[PDB]
PDB file of C-alpha atoms in Angstrom:
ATOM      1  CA  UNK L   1    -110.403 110.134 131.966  1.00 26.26           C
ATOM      2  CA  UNK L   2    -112.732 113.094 131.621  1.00 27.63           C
ATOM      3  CA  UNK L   3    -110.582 115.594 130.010  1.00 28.29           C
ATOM      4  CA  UNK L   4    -107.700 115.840 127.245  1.00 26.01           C
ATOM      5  CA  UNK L   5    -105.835 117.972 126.029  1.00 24.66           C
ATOM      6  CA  UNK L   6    -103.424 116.944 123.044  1.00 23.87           C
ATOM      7  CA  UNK L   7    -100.583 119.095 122.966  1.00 26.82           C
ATOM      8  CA  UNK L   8     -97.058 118.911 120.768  1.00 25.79           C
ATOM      9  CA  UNK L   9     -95.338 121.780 119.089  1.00 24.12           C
ATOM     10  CA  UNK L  10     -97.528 123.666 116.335  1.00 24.75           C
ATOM     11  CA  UNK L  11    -100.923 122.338 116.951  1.00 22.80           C
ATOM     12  CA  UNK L  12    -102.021 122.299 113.105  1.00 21.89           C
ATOM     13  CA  UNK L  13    -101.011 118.143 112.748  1.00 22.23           C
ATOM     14  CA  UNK L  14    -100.707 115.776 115.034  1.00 20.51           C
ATOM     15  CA  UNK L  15    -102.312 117.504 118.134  1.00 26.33           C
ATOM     16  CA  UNK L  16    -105.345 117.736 115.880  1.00 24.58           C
ATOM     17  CA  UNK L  17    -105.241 114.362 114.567  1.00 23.08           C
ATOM     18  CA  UNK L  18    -105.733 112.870 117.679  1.00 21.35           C
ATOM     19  CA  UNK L  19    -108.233 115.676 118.867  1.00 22.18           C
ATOM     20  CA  UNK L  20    -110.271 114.922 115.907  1.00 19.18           C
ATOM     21  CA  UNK L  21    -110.175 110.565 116.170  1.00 20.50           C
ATOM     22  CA  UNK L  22    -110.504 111.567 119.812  1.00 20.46           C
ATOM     23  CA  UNK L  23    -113.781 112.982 119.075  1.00 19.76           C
ATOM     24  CA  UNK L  24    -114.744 110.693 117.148  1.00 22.76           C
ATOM     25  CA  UNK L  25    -114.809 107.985 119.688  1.00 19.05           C
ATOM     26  CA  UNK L  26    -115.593 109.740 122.549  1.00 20.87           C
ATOM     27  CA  UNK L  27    -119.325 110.357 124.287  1.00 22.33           C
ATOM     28  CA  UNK L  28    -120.171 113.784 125.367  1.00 20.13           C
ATOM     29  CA  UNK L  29    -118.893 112.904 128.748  1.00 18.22           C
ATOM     30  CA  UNK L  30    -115.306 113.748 127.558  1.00 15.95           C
ATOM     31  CA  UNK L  31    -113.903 117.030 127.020  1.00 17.50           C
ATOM     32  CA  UNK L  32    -111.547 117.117 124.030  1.00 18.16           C
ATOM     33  CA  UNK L  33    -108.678 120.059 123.973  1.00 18.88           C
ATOM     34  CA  UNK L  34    -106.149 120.713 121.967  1.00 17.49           C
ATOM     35  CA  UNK L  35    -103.022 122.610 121.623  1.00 15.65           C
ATOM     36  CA  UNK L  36     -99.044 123.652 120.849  1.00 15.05           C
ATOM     37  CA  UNK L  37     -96.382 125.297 122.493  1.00 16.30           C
ATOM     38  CA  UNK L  38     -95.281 127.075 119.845  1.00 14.99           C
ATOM     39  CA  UNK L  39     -98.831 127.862 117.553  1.00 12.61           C
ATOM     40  CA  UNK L  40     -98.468 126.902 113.876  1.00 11.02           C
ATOM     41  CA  UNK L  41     -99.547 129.480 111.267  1.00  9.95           C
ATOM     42  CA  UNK L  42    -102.412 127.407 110.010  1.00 10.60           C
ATOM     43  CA  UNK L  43    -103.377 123.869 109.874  1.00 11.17           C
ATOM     44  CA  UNK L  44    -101.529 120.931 108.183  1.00 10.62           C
ATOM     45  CA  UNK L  45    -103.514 119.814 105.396  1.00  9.01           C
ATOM     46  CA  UNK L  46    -102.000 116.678 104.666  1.00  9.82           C
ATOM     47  CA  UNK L  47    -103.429 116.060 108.548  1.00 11.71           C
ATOM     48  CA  UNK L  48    -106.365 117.525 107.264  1.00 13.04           C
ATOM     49  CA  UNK L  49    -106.956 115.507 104.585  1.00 15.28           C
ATOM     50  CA  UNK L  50    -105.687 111.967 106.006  1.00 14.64           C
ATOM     51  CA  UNK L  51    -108.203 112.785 108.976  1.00 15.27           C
ATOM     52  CA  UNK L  52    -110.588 113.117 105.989  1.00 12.64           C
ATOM     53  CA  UNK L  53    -110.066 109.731 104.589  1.00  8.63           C
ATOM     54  CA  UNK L  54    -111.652 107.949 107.914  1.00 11.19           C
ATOM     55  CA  UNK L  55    -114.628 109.810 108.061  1.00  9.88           C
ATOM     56  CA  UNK L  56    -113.453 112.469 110.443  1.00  7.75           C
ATOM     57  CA  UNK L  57    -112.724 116.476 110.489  1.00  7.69           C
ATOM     58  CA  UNK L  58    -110.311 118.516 112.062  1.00  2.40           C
ATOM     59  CA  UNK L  59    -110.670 121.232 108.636  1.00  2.00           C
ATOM     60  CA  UNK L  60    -112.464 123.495 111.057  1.00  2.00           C
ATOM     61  CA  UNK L  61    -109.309 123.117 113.840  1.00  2.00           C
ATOM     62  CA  UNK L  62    -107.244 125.800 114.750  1.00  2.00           C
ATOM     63  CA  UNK L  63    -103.696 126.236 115.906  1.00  2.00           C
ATOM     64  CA  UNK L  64    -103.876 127.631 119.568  1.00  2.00           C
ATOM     65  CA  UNK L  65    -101.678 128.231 122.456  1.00  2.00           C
ATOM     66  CA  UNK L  66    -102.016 126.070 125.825  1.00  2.00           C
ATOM     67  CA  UNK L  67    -104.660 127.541 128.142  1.00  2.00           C
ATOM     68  CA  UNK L  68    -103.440 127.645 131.591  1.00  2.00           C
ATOM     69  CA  UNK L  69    -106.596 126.475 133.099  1.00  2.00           C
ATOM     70  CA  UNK L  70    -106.948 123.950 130.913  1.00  2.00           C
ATOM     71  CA  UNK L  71    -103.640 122.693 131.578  1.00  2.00           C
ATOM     72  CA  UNK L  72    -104.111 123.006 135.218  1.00  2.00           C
ATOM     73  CA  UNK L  73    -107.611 121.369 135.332  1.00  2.00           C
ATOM     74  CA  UNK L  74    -107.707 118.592 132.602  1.00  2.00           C
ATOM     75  CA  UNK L  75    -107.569 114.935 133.710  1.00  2.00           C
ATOM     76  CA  UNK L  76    -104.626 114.010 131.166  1.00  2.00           C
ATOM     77  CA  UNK L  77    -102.488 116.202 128.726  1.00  2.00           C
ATOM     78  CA  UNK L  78    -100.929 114.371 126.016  1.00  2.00           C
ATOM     79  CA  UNK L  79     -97.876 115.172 124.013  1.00  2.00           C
ATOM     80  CA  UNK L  80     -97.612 113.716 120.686  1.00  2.00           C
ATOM     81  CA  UNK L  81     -94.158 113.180 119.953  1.00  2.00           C
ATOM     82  CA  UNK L  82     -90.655 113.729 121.097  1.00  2.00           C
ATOM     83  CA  UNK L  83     -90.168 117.568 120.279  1.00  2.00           C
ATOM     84  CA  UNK L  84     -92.990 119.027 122.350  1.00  2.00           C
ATOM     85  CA  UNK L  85     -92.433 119.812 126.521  1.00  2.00           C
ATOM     86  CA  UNK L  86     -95.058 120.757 128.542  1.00  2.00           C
ATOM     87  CA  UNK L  87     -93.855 121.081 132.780  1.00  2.00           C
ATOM     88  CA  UNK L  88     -97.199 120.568 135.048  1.00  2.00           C
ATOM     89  CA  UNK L  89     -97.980 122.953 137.398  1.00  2.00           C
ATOM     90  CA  UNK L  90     -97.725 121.926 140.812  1.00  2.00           C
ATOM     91  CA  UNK L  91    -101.324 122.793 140.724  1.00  2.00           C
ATOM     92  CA  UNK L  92    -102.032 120.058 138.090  1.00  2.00           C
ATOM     93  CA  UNK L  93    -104.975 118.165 138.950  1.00  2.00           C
ATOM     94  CA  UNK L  94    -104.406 115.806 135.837  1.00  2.00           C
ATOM     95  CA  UNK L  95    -101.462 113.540 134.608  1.00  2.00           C
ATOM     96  CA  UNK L  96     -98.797 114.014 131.832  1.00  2.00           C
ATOM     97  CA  UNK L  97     -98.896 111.094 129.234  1.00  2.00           C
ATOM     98  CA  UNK L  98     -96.047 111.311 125.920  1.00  2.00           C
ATOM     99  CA  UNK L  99     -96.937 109.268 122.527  1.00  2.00           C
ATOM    100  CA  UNK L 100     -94.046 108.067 120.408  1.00  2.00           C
ATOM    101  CA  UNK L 101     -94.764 108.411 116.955  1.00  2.00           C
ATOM    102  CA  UNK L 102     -92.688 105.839 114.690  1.00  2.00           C
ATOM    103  CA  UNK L 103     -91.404 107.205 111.914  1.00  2.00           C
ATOM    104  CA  UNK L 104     -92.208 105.554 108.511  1.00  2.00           C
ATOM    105  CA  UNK L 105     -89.984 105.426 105.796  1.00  2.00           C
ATOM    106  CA  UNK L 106     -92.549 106.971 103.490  1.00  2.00           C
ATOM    107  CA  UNK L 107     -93.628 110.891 102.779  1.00  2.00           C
ATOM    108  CA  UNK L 108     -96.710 113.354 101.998  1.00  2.00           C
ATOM    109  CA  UNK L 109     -99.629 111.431 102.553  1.00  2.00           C
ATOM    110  CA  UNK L 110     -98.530 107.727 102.910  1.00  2.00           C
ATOM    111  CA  UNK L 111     -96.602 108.907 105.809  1.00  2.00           C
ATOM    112  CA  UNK L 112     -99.447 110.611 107.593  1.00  2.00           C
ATOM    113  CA  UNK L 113    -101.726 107.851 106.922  1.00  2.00           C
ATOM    114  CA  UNK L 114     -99.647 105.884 109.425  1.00  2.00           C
ATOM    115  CA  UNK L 115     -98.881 108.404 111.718  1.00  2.00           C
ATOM    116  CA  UNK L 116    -102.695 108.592 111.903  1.00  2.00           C
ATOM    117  CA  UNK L 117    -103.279 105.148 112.187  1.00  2.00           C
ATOM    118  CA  UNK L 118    -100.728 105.183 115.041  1.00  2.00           C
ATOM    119  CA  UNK L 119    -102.652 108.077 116.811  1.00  2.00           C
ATOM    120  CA  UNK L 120    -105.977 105.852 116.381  1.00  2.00           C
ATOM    121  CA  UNK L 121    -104.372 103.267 118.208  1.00  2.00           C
ATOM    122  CA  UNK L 122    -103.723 104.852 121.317  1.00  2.00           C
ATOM    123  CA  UNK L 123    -106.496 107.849 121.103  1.00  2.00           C
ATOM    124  CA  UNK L 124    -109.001 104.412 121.472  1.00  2.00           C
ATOM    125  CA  UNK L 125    -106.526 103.027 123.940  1.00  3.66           C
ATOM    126  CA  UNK L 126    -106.821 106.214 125.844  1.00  6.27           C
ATOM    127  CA  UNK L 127    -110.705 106.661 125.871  1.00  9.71           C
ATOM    128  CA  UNK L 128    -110.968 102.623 126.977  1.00 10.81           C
TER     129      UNK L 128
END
């Protein structure tokens, strides 16, 4: 696992979340993407700032569409979520992977502190 790209729907939250904790974690050696099917109009800064709070930065992100060479050449994309949908090319060289995020029964940021802590889970899963 040499490449990633993090895809779900608006890339301006959770997308950049895990690009960000991705980073984070990750040596040089990995290539961290990310991206939305459907580009936000800026970034979410209650993302922003619970990214923030664990000593990482995605305040410099930006919402983007998929590259199709990226999508063809990465070794995994990775939906967040159960909106976004993302069909790999036959070409594909990498593998399709989908996160569930468990809703809390909280809002603002107390609800995006554990969708984040969620996303660490499985962004240090993924990199192991």
């Amino acid at each position: 696992m040499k490449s990633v790209l993090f895809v779900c729907v608006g890339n301006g939250g959770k997308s950049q979340m895990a690009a960000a904790l991705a980073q984070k974690y990750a040596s040089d050696s990995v290539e961290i993407h990310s991206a939305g099917t459907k580009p936000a109009q800026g970034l979410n800064q209650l993302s922003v700032e619970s990214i923030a709070e664990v000593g990482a930065d995605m305040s410099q992100g930006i919402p983007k569409a998929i590259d199709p060479e990226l999508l063809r050449t990465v070794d995994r994309v990775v939906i967040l979520g159960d909106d976004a949908q993302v069909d790999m090319p036959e070409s594909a060289q990498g593998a399709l992977e989908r996160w569930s995020i468990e809703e809390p029964d909280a809002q603002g940021m107390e609800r995006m502190r554990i969708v984040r802590d969620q996303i660490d889970n499985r962004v240090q899963a993924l990199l192991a």
